[PDB]
């Protein structure tokens, strides 16, 4: 086709309807489903699909034991038809690694896979199913990328990497690629002290990213990248309605340019649609672990250090395991504004369910309605006892 341009704004977000659910672990009890994690949803001009890091194993396979381990030569970024489980027979391996991101640019698709020793990691960039550019570790400490899709404006796809301490100050870089080649890269700027696992979306020629300040912040950092001038900046979501996990209990006035104190060196990947009054934050119900999942509408959540929920929608109940969550939109769909969407990683097995040696996930992805639709909870639905 032709390089896509984020020309429309966000649609009014009134509720959320289901979009897709793979039910992968339930179907995984009696089928050749693959152990995966860090999934995400991402579209082409012709189809949206499921993306996640496979573990080179089936759930019910003897190698699924140990799969709580994040990195190995055995992981691959794989994609599959929307709402189907990541089966052995139907998955397309995009590239090899233990960290990735991917996005269609209107003409073709760029997929990035990082892999290797912790202190010698590499970022190999593919473009139209061919490897094109290589980026070696700069701070020699777990080079990781988005674990979510990227966003492109006029062939330009900015991607945010991080290399260095999770526990402290690392070297985060926004790379700006075009057809597989770097156009430029620049040091994370603004007031975000640490940045990891960016959930990014585009609207009106500008990409925004709600990331995860792992170090000290319990409110998320935000990077707004201008794909045309090629400059970005960073800040924290002002709302007192905290969204990291673990996180402190909701205070009454937030902090806009500093990490929100309370819990350290830990968190989880989450997203958010900051669109003025059209603002919805996503979070785990518990402040203690990755369980539950809600979508709260906190108008001017980004700018207003005293913004509170005005409306809500429950996704996963507190009793059910949730996890990493991200954003994506079908930038090629018929319409006058972009319909925001998201997914929620629903993890089963280690560490919360130690009666099994595997860790794996299921996906449930939701999209905005302008209508006020009735809610339901979408759990993974697997009886862990069936696996013993």
């Amino acid at each position, epitope marked *: 086709r032709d390089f896509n341009n984020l020309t429309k704004g966000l649609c009014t977000i009134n509720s959320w309807h289901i979009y897709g659910k793979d039910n992968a672990v339930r179907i995984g009890e009696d089928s050749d489903v693959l152990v995966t994690r860090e999934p995400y949803v991402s579209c082409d001009p012709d189809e949206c699909r499921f993306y996640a890091l496979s573990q080179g194993t089936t759930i019910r396979g003897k190698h699924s034991n140990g799969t709580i381990h994040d990195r190995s030569q055995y992981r691959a970024l794989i994609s599959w038809p929307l709402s189907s489980p990541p089966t052995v027979y139907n998955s397309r391996v995009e590239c090899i690694g233990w960290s990735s991101t991917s996005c269609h640019d209107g003409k073709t698709r760029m997929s990035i896979c990082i892999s290797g020793p912790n202190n010698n990691a590499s970022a190999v960039i593919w473009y139209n199913r061919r490897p094109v550019t290589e980026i070696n570790t700069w701070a020699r400490n777990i080079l990781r990328t988005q674990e979510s899709e990227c966003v492109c404006h006029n062939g330009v796809c900015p991607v945010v990497f991080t290399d260095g301490s999770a526990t402290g100050p690392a070297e985060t870089r926004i790379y700006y690629f075009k057809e597989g080649k770097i156009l430029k890269w620049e040091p994370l700027a603004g007031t975000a002290k640490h940045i990891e696992e960016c959930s990014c979306y585009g609207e009106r020629a500008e990409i925004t990213c709600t990331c995860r300040d792992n170090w000290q912040g319990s409110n998320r950092p935000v990077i707004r990248i201008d794909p045309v001038a090629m400059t970005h900046t960073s800040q924290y979501i002002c709302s007192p309605v905290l969204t990291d996990n673990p996180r402190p*209990n909701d205070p009454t006035v937030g902090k806009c340019n500093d990490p929100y104190p309370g819990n350290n060196n830990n968190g989880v990947k989450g997203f958010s649609y900051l669109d003025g009054v059209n603002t919805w934050l996503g979070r785990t119900i518990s402040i*203690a672990s990755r369980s539950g999942y809600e979508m709260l509408k906190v108008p001017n959540a980004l700018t207003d250090d005293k913004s509170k929920p005005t409306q809500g929608q429950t996704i996963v109940l507190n009793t059910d395991w949730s996890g990493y969550s991200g954003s994506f939109m079908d930038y090629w769909a018929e319409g006058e504004c972009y319909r925001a969407c998201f997914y929620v990683e629903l993890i089963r097995g280690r560490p*919360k369910e130690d009666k099994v040696w595997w860790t794996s996930n299921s996906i449930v992805s939701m999209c905005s309605s302008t209508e006020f639709l009735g809610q339901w909870d979408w759990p993974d639905g697997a009886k862990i006892e069936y696996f013993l």
Partner: antibody
Amino acid sequence: QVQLQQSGAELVKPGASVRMSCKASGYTFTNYNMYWVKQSPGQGLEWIGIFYPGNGDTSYNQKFKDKATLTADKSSNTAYMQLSSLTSEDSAVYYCARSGGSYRYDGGFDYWGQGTTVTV
Amino acid sequence: DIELTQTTSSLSASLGDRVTISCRASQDISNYLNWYQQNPDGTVKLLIYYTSNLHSEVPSRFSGSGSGTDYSLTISNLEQEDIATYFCQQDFTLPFTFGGGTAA
């Protein structure tokens, strides 16, 4: 009303492992965070961890991570606690409390148990 | 990590008195402070949850106030039943931390 029937005292030597009980009543055991405190003469009230009946979620004050192990019996509506490799430094009155905000982590410990003295 | 410093280890007052026990936290705990009464027979009860909120059946003569890091328990009219130790405790962030307590 709500009630927390803890077990009786324990006398024991080092290296061992005592295992307490906290029997719930007067509420839906499944809808609340069961906390466990350690009032030590000299270290005051210290919080050990949480166990949630609904889904078996747990978390421990890092300090007591290796010593304590929380479990529960939804059947009998009873929370249990098990300290390992006892020492005189683990001698104290172990209390069990309920969450003020049910499944949430706030609202104070609205109901406690009468304690369960361990003596090493 | 958030240390609660329950100032004034012990307290002395005549029956009928107004007493105030102070609990100053290490970090702005954001009104997530609590008060517990531990009777001489070991029994603990929740007095005030969340700075000023009174618990079920709690004697109205028990006022609770404060902000930021400094909070206070105030018993308007002292009574014998009020001879116990008082602990403050925060639930702003895990791990829940208690205050040194104060015997009056």
